[PDB]
Amino acid sequence: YFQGMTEYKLVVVGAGGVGKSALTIQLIQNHFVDEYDPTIEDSYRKQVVIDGETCLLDILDTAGHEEYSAMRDQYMRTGEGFLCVFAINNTKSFEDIHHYREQIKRVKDSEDVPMVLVGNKCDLPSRTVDTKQAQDLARSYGIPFIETSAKTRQGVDDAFYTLVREIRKHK
Ligand SMILES: Nc1nc2c(ncn2[C@@H]2O[C@H](COP(=O)(O)OP(=O)(O)NP(=O)(O)O)[C@@H](O)[C@H]2O)c(=O)[nH]1
Ligand SMILES: COc1cccc(-c2ccc(Nc3ccc(C[NH+](C)C)cc3)c(OC)c2)c1
Ligand SMILES: [Mg+2]
């Protein structure tokens, strides 16, 4: 019996400065944050309708630069889907995606975790990562790729909604 709307626990991961917080705040507040305030851990919530189903997104916004914590592994165990974010002007953030994916596969002990690859800051002219490279990486992992800008709001809804659709397909 229906006791309230379905809830989805999403975790936003990726290197320092790629725009994880900016993406989340654009989704929740329709606000672009220009300042860089490094995150340790922040929790957000939003009700949306995706494909005719009302649901609640519980979003955990993570730290880019973090050593081994068992506290980190805990929320990666409970998270049901992961936005893996790099910045299209930062090649290192793109190469770090492999490390986030491995970390997630290890803690969930699974090959088939709901995930979306997100290439953020697509409004900047200093692209160093081609769309095609990122699409090929996503195709090799069997996951969707979405280009976003927290500043223009391009792809922001889509990134989160796509992840929810991936979670739904997985169960
Ligand atoms: N032009 C542009 N700037 C962006 C975009 N997303 C984020 N930024 C900028 O990049 C900086 C870092 O954004 P922020 O969301 O804090 O990064 P983060 O990944 O949450 N960092 P951390 O892991 O330290 O928490 C900020 O100055 C922000 O305004 C984007 O899509 N376009
Ligand atoms: C442990 O690993 C996870 C992993 C992923 C998401 C979550 C999650 C995020 C936010 C909330 N909830 C929440 C969201 C925003 C606020 C802030 N309030 C001021 C509204 C409080 C709770 C949540 O609750 C079940 C779960 C937990
Ligand atoms: Mg942040």
Residue numbers in the entry: -3 to 167
Quote what the paper states about this structure.
We used these analyses to design of cross-over compounds linking the common diphenyl-anchoring moiety of PPIN-1 and PPIN-2 to the Abd-7 aniline fragment. All three compounds showed very similar binding modes to Abd-7 with van der Waals contacts to K5, L6, V7, S39, Y40, R41, D54, I55, L56, G70, Y71, T74, and G75. Ch-1 was found in four of the six KRAS169Q61H chains (A, B, C, and F); Ch-2 was again found in three of the six chains (A, B, and C) and Ch-3 was found in four of the six chains (A, B, C, and D). Thus, by combining the anchor constituent of the PPIN compounds with the aniline fragment of Abd-7, we generated a compound series showing good electron density for the entire molecule when bound to KRAS pocket 1. While the interaction of the high-affinity WT iDAb with RAS was minimally affected, even at the highest dose of compound (i.e., 20 μM), both the lower-affinity–dematured iDAb and CRAF binding to RAS were progressively impaired, starting at the lowest dose of 5 μM. Phosphorylation of AKT (downstream of RAS-PI3K signaling) or phosphorylation of ERK (downstream of RAS-RAF signaling) was determined following EGF stimulation. The PPIN-2 (and control Abd-2) had no effect on the levels of phospho-AKT or phospho-ERK even at 20 μM (addressed using Western blotting), but we found that the three cross-over compounds caused loss of phospho-AKT or phospho-ERK, as did the previously described compound Abd-7. Structural comparison of the six chains in the asymmetric unit show that compound binding has a minimal effect on the conformation of the switch regions in RAS protein.
The RAS family of oncogenic proteins is important as therapy targets because of the frequency of activating mutations in almost all major cancers. All family members function by signal transduction to the nucleus of cells via interaction with effectors (such as RAF, RALGDS, and PI3K) that catalyze phosphorylation of downstream proteins. When KRAS is bound to GDP, the protein is in the inactive state and becomes activated by nucleotide exchange from GDP to GTP. Mutant RAS proteins remain in the active state and hydrolyze GTP at a much slower rate than wild-type (WT) RAS.
